[PDB]
Amino acid sequence: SMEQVAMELRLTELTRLLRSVLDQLQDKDPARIFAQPVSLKEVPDYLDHIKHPMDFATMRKRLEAQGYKNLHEFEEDFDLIIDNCMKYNARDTVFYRAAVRLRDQGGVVLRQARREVDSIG
């Protein structure tokens, strides 16, 4: 139906906007600490600590399959990246600190992304 096509076009346009958001947030991680999944070869106990691992590459796979239906879903995955790191790693570490700086800088980007999503519909 035409209604289904129109809903698909909206999902495509959201995907475009979330790709620009994703690029902008990942620029706030110049060390590439959050670029890839924590390796279970290198951190064998990780899944005993962290129940829902997340990273930018995993989010990009989901995005390219148009797997985010709304901005809330995308933000959920971004907050897991930050929140998982702040639990596993102590305050005194470069990992925790990188997560704090990503959260602080990413908030700015997400604030305007929400206005754009609501504005354009």
Curated annotation (Swiss-Prot):
Glycyl lysine isopeptide (Lys-Gly) (interchain with G-Cter in SUMO2) crosslink: positions? K41
Tissue specificity of this protein: Highly expressed in testis.
Q: Which residues form the Bromo domain?
A: 9-113
Q: Where in the cell is it found?
A: Nucleus; Chromosome
Signal peptide (from-to): none
Q: How does it assemble?
A: Component of some HBO1 complex composed of KAT7/HBO1, MEAF6, ING4 and BRD1/BRPF2. Component of the MOZ/MORF complex composed at least of ING5, KAT6A, KAT6B, MEAF6 and one of BRPF1, BRD1/BRPF2 and BRPF3. Interacts (via PHD-type zinc finger domain) with unmodified histone H3. Interacts (via PWWP domain) with dimethylated and trimethylated 'Lys-79' on histone H3.
Q: What is the role of this chain?
A: Scaffold subunit of various histone acetyltransferase (HAT) complexes, such as the MOZ/MORF and HBO1 complexes, that acts as a regulator of hematopoiesis. Plays a key role in HBO1 complex by directing KAT7/HBO1 specificity towards histone H3 'Lys-14' acetylation (H3K14ac), thereby promoting erythroid differentiation.
**Full protein name:** Bromodomain-containing protein 1
Q: Which organism is it from?
A: Homo sapiens (Human)
Taxonomy of the source species: Eukaryota, Metazoa, Chordata, Craniata, Vertebrata
What gene name is listed for this protein? BRD1
